Amino acid sequence: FKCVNSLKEDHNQPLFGVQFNWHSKEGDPLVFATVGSNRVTLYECHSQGEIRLLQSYVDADADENFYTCAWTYDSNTSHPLLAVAGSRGIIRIINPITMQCIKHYVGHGNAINELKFHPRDPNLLLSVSKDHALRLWNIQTDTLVAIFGGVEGHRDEVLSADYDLLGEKIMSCGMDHSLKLWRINSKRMMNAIKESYDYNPNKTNRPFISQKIHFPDFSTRDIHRNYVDCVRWLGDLILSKSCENAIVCWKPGKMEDDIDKIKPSESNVTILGRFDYSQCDIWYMRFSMDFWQKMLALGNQVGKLYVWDLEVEDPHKAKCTTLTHHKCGAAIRQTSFSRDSSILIAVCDDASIWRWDR
Numbered sequence: 001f002k003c004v005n006s007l008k009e010d011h012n013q014p015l016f017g018v019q020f021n022w023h024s025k026e027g028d029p030l031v032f033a034t035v036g037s038n039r040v041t042l043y044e045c046h047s048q049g050e051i052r053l054l055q056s057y058v059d060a061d062a063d064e065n066f067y068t069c070a071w072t073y074d075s076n077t078s079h080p081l082l083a084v085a086g087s088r089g090i091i092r093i094i095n096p097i098t099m100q101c102i103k104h105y106v107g108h109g110n111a112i113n114e115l116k117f118h119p120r121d122p123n124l125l126l127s128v129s130k131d132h133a134l135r136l137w138n139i140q141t142d143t144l145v146a147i148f149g150g151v152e153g154h155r156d157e158v159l160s161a162d163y164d165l166l167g168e169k170i171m172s173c174g175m176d177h178s179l180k181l182w183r184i185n186s187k188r189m190m191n192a193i194k195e196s197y198d199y200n201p202n203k204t205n206r207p208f209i210s211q212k213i214h215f216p217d218f219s220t221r222d223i224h225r226n227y228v229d230c231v232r233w234l235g236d237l238i239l240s241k242s243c244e245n246a247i248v249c250w251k252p253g254k255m256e257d258d259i260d261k262i263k264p265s266e267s268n269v270t271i272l273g274r275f276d277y278s279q280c281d282i283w284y285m286r287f288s289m290d291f292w293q294k295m296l297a298l299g300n301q302v303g304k305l306y307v308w309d310l311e312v313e314d315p316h317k318a319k320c321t322t323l324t325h326h327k328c329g330a331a332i333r334q335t336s337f338s339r340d341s342s343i344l345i346a347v348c349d350d351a352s353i354w355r356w357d358r
Contacts, residue, residue, distance in 0.1 A: 001307070001344060003325045004049030005355040013037040015347035016086075016284070017068045018336040021096070022291060023080045030338045031096070033082055034347055035066035040084050042096055043353075045343055051355055057084070057092075057099040064088045064330055067298050070115040072122045075140055083111035083125060083139075091127060093139060107144055113159050113174075113284075118167040124193070127168065128158040134172055136184070139194040143208040145196045146189065148172070148182050150214025160240075160286065164233045169217070173228035173240055176349075180216035181252065181262070218262050219248060230286040234299075237272060237315060243283055247275040247298065249284045249315040273316030277306045282331060290337040299332025299346050305356070306346075328354055 009015065015036035030045040030293040033053070038061065042054040066086035072081050081102070082094045082339055089112055091105040100324055111130035116125035133149035148170070156175035168185040183189070192211045199208045224242035231240045234249065236259040241247045249272045252262050257270075280300040285296070287298035289310075296308040296318075305323035312318060323344075330348035337344050344356040 001321075001323055001356045001358055003323070003328075003354060004357045005051050006325075006327070007051055007353050009034070009036065009041065009351040009353070011037040011039070012351050014331075014333060015351055015353065016066070016333050018334050018345050018347045018353075019069050019071055020336045020338045020343070020345070021071045021082075022339040023071055023073045030340075030343060032336055032338075032345055033069045033071070033096070034087065034353060035069045035084055035086070036347070036351060038062060038064040040066060040069060040082065040094060042097070042099075043193040045338070045344050045355070048357060049357070051353065055099045057094050057101065059088075061088065064090075068114045069111065070117050070125070072117045072125070072139075075122050075250045083115050083117075085115055085127060087111045089129065089131075091115070091125070091137070103139075105139075105142070105144075107135060111157075113140070113157065114161060116161060116163060118172070119163050119165065120167050124196070126161060126163070128161045128172060128174075130157045132156060132158065134158060134161060134170070138193070141191070141196055141199045141208075143199050145192050145209045146211035146213055148213045148216075149211070152215050152219075154178065154180065159227065159229045159284065160231045162232050165235065168314060171233060171238060172203045173231040175227045176221070177224055177226060177228060177242075178219055178221045179223060179228060179231060179238065179240060179338055181218035182213060183217045205307075213265060215263075217264055218266050219264075220252065221271055223248050223250055225273075227283050229284050232287070232289060234310070234315070235237070239287075239296070241287065241298075243281045243285070245277055245280050247287065247296070249273045249275075264279075272314070273318070275308055275318060275320065279304070284333065285331070286334045288335045288337065291339050295337070295341070297335040297337065297344055301331040301336060303328035303330055303332060303348065305332065305335070305344075321333060325354065329335060
């Protein structure tokens with residue numbers, strides 16, 4: 001990796017999220033979305049470092065603050081869609097071509113900190129909120145499938161969450177210092193999903209009933225001692241961080257315990273390694289991985305990039321390299337790899353964007 005370009009968005013507010021579009025068709029250029037201030041911006045990546053500016057969606061309210069975006073496609077037409085959400089607690093489904101808001105979901109009412117799409121179903125959107133809950137949505141039938149909350153749920157803002165490889169279970173984390181597992185392969189949840197696909201408000205009288213899920217299938221506050229601001233499955237293992245300059249790789253239960261045999265009462269965790277770094281004690285600094293999960297990237301609060309090569313027998317044997325530039329001095333809030341891994345983008349608190357080519 002070498003730094004080939006950079007630029008700065010006119011607004012000067014923090015860029016909180018960047019995502020490449022991993023659903024981009026064969027032979028079109030790599031396109032990525034940034035979010036910050038009250039807008040979304042698409043860029044196209046070209047030779048010689050060029051970052052070709054496309055078009056923005058700018059929320060009507062100047063007080064909207066987008067925090068996160070996530071790419072999917074339309075399940076009938078294959079056209080990519082981009083979901084955005086932020087401080088107003090509104091999910092917006094944007095047509096990236098024209099940047100029209102196609103539709104939006106209210107319900108959270110309170111800030112959405114992260115969005116994720118199911119790894120196998122393009123219609124299933126998970127939002128995580130400042131209101132302590134997760135919601136699962138079916139953006140095909142415009143239904144709220146479930147709410148993951150209650151007193152045994154998170155007891156403070158949720159910051160991050162992630163589906164496992166097959167979308168059978170979710171791991172959430174947030175400001176209560178905890179990570180919670182939620183199975184979505186139960187009979188109940190598989191059936192709720194099925195019912196959400198059968199729902200057509202024009203062909204019936206009922207509202208769609210959401211599942212209230214009030215009991216995580218596992219929970220722990222034993223990994224970090226602060227806000228857990230980023231979470232990612234690595235197979236049956238977990239990669240998570242707080243503001244303590246460490247990504248911990250760990251699993252619920254003892255060393256030889258199966259993830260699918262974990263009862264809600266499980267009080268053990270196993271730590272399999274820890275990736276330490278520097279100058280990352282601020283909240284809401286998120287790492288990302290490439291498509292194959294070979295590598296992990298996190299930037300810190302002074303513009304240094306850390307990249308881990310996870311292509312090694314055990315999690316603790318990961319190989320770190322660092323990416324610095326003399327002009328990149330602002331906090332980096334998120335990174336994104338292209339689908340093919342040839343490009344890495346970092347985005348910063350100063351509205352700058354950094355392009356790193358392999």
